[PDB]
Amino acid sequence: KGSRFISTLQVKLYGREGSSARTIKATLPYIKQDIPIVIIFRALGIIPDGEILEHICYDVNDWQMLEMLKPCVEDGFVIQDRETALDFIGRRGTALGIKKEKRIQYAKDILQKEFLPHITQLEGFESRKAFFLGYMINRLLLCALDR
């Protein structure tokens, strides 16, 4: 109950069974482009790879799923901190909404109000929404690995 934001989040595995550079990007409500999963985690606050990987793959042994995450890590290598991640999200509008202070402030709002609105639409719940996204990537890869 309450407005009912019918925002459907898609977590896309680019590349086909036998194509090189199989990246994972996700289409965020009010954002035109599909952002590589990594940048989303970074914008969330989960900054180093492996801290990011821990949210997706739960078994340190499972090399198979982990190799499948290496391209994503390479895709999100450009963005290295939380701020630069939000700018990258803010750049891709919206419309664009030109001004540096404006775009970084946006991405904050989208992740809070339009990204995974069940769970919470509150503030300090990045940890919850990160583990969920990671549970989603786990399921995306689990099916692609024919398990």
Partner: peptide
Amino acid sequence: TTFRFCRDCNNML
């Protein structure tokens, strides 16, 4: 395979 991370960064190798 079984890969490692950087101690200090935790970033991949």
